[PDB]
Amino acid sequence: PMSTRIAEATSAIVSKHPARVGLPPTASSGHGYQCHVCSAVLFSPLDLDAHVASHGLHGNMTLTSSEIQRHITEFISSWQNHPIVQVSADVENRKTAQLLHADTPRLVTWDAGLCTSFKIVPIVPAQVPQDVLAYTFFTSSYAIQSPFPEAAVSRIVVHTRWASNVDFDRDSSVIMAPPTENNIHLFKQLLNTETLSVRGANPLMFRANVLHMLLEFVLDNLYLNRHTGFSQDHTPFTEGANLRSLPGPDAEKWYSIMYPTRMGTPNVSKICNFVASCVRNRVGRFDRAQMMNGAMSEWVDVFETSDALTVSIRGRWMARLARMNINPTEIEWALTECAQGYVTVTSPYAPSVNRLMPYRISNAERQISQIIRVMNIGNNATVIQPVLQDISVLLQRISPLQIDPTIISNTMSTVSESTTQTLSPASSILGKLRPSNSDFSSFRVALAGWLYNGVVTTVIDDSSYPKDGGSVTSLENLWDFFILALALPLTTDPCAPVKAFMTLANMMVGFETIPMDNQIYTQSRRASAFSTPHTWPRCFMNIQLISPIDAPILRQWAEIIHRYWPNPSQIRYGTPNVFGSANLFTPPEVLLLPIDHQPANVTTPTLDFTNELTNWRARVCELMKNLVDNQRYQPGWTQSLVSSMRGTLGKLKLIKSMTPMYLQQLAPVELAVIAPMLPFPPFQVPYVRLDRDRVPTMVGVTRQSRDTITQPALSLSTTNTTVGVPLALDARAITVALLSGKYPPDLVTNVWYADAIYPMYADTEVFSNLQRDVITCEAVQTLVTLVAQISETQYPVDRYLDWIPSLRASAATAATFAEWVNTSMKTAFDLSDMLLEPLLSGDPRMTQLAIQYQQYNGRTFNVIPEMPGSVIADCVQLTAEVFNHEYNLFGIARGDIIIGRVQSTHLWSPLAPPPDLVFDRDTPGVHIFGRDCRISFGMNGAAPMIRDETGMMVPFEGNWIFPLALWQMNTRYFNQQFDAWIKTGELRIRIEMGAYPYMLHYYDPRQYANAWNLTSAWLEEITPTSIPSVPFMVPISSDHDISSAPAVQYIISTEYNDRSLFCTNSSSPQTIAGPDKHIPVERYNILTNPDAPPTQIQLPEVVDLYNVVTRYAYETPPITAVVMGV
Amino acid sequence: EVLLLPIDHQPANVTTPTLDFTNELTNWRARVCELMKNLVDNQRYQPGW
């Protein structure tokens, strides 16, 4: 195909191999292998061929194919050594694209259906035909539906909200089957990659998967209950109750399931006694908030079914968004003073319709997001370059200044000289002022590089330095010095003055000598090599070391650097009210400029010659005139050439260019105009002119702690990681854009900047990154709070899960679990790019977020932002506490089980045993088998054998307590030793777990039952890695009396674990046999108490299943729909 | 009855912190790294870069 053909064509012409890794180049390993005449080594791809061509006689040049491709090699090497194309690349890398544009998350989500998280499923149906009762007692015979299912036994289960019309789903869900089915698939999810059993689970990851389920369960309910409309009742069941009409086709059984007090109570069924015991005026609409005539009411209040958990969760989430909220007047103010005039935006002055724009955050979230982005960008060269180029092309869009490099050709056309003198300074500087491969982007790139010193140090290329050629007689090298000396003060490196000095010191060699630090960095050591404050010679740091009678030129060059170097300034971009300032290391609301700035009062600016830049060009040019007039070092030219030099330099000094005027008194204004409208906010270390102190030697971020130490200011110093990279620029094209600058002939400033600044402010791109940073900070606080539960951390947290078994976690366990938390958080909010991967590179246990920078003397300036509040982790702690008090709801039993034969005609539930069957460690005559027991046999009529923890000898009998791992590690031997004594003998084992899932098998008590098959199956299947669920065998209640039959039990609970039961025999008048539980009136506090206030929840102990709840009609229109201007 | 080995041992614990300079090997790596940091710091050793 053509594409691979062009790929091999390009790779043939350009992509030849040797990329020249930097060795100390050795004689027996050189690129010129044997220079075929001279038989030596030459190290370089142009050296060996230029040397063989030097063996070619010069006056007999002939075209060969070799003669063609030697020029091809020189051309390709010239293109390869170009400073911009080595770093520029068009395609992104999922990192640079993430930085340039972020996946905005889905915040404002809605629920039109009813809010809840629990439901009531029936299990065994009721005896709807029978003998002792007539058929017409039951309301199902007359076919009246009812919210609680008319069945024999009904339990409440957990199913995430099961009723909700939704605008946009959270893909997280927690679905739990009824307890007659299996639920260990909910618990084997997390780290059980080695449980081969489909119905198995390793106990050591129980707590980890339970709290991951808690995170899923809270992460699912992030919706807002929406107002939907109402309707007045016409039936006399509840007078005046404006009932609520959910959307969707199904609307029939919903009113029965929503409003339990609506029905009549014809008989002495348990639900009918309950609804007769309920109060009357507490259903439906009872409070609305109208603002305007004929308009949708904003928030109402309603008496519908909901649990206090999910009500509280969505209340916390709504409080979060209400803190985030803003209003269009402040949008107008903040946007127009962010624009600093030059546009306008209009907000209406009218009574509002009560909308909702969640955008306002505090400064801490922005600072944390700065830390995350800089930690991402750390030492990556090709990531910041597209952002910098984006600001470059944006500034080319915004600027009225047009680079017109022909004007210097126009003015060098009129210089006068002789013709017989064939060293032409004018034509030479036109050739040398011709840039590299037509680039002029480098100036705008360098201008945009002022926004970032702390990550990017813009240096010029080493290729602009004149290749060891310092010959001051070489006018080539002299124009080179002039170009570079104009170009250097634009760069943002801390060492541009010493580089401007040492390029003259490397230019002139052997005329005048200076003393310096060592012989390593001598007077001829290349000027690009210094680049750090420690390499600064104090012949430059002190002018008196340079001898004046010896070195007048060099003394006045060092003096001119010390005096006429530019000075920093500031312009204060930004806005404090909206867009909390991300300006760390600085005050808020400041743009640190490197050059002097003052505003122009005119609106039609025209030429003058008074700023640091025009002064600087005049200074270096008159000093160049002193160079050519140095009588004892350059009289060796012709006087025609001398006068042409003076004329060319005087005209070059009085060139007319609008570039320095622009750079002084126009450009930082629109830098401030742009600077807040960026995907990547500014990041500035304090600029400084020449002094050795107060120069940033580095800048570093942290991600973790080190030891037992906890204080981050102490921990940071041996923990930071250095961030930053130098960038290369074409000083020639820099100087071209400095020397040639042209305004339009009729430019008016407010006109031009109005037309050019307005159409970029129809974009709402800046606002989405705020909510992105919200989700970032909430996610990292969620991560530290959740990882605090499974291992010991440095943050104070309140624990609740401590009774459930848990693994002694390692850093690999914590890292894997944090990946699960990342994936869980990532499923919500609909985003595909990176989230908290910089955090996940390191140890997740001891994490902390901070930054510093160090001066040259040893002074360090750290910034530690305090992590703000987190509604997510707050709600996680809430659900943890609620699960601690309501552990049975997710199919968990506290305590443990006791294995032992119980054969009786009683009907007591194994979820709640009589107290004599259980025993503890305090029970006398009980043998605790803690550790290291052994089992001997019985020799010829003897009894078999086991060793006590206390060293005592004991046979197989009585009351034993096993740690669970003791059974797990040895279950194959222990089953064969123990099971037959469990079946017919007398020993009763109390194994302990803390927590376990379970399944429920029922039976009817009229006939025989036995559970030895189920118990032997469980005792057989249990494994050193995994366990299967614990089967129970619990009876079925009935209204009439039954004749009992004996059953045999083996698995009983320890304490009460029958919390999940809900009103056995609900349609019955009463219940004789089995357990007898009516409607739990503690769940319905509001309906049974006339004294309770409406917004009452007894939430942390028990959770109600019906409460007051508010529903909203807050719309979210976009910003360009709300506010606009022209 | 004993067995020499040129590195200090420790009774086992799985939950020990990853970063720990009580650990001799991590101490060694950290000191070697920060010495090379001290080497590169001021660029008085290499010219040419």
Automatic annotation (TrEMBL), chain B:
Its subcellular locations are: Virion
Q: Which residues cross the membrane?
A: none
Species for this entry = Mammalian orthoreovirus 3
Task: Quote the function comment for this protein.
Answer: Inner capsid protein that self-assembles to form an icosahedral capsid with a T=2 symmetry, which consists of 120 copies of VP2, with channels at each of its five-fold vertices. This capsid constitutes the innermost concentric layer of the viral mature particle.
Protein name, entry field: Lambda-1 protein
Task: Give the signal peptide range.
Answer: none
> Which residues of the whole protein are included?
737 to 785 of 1275
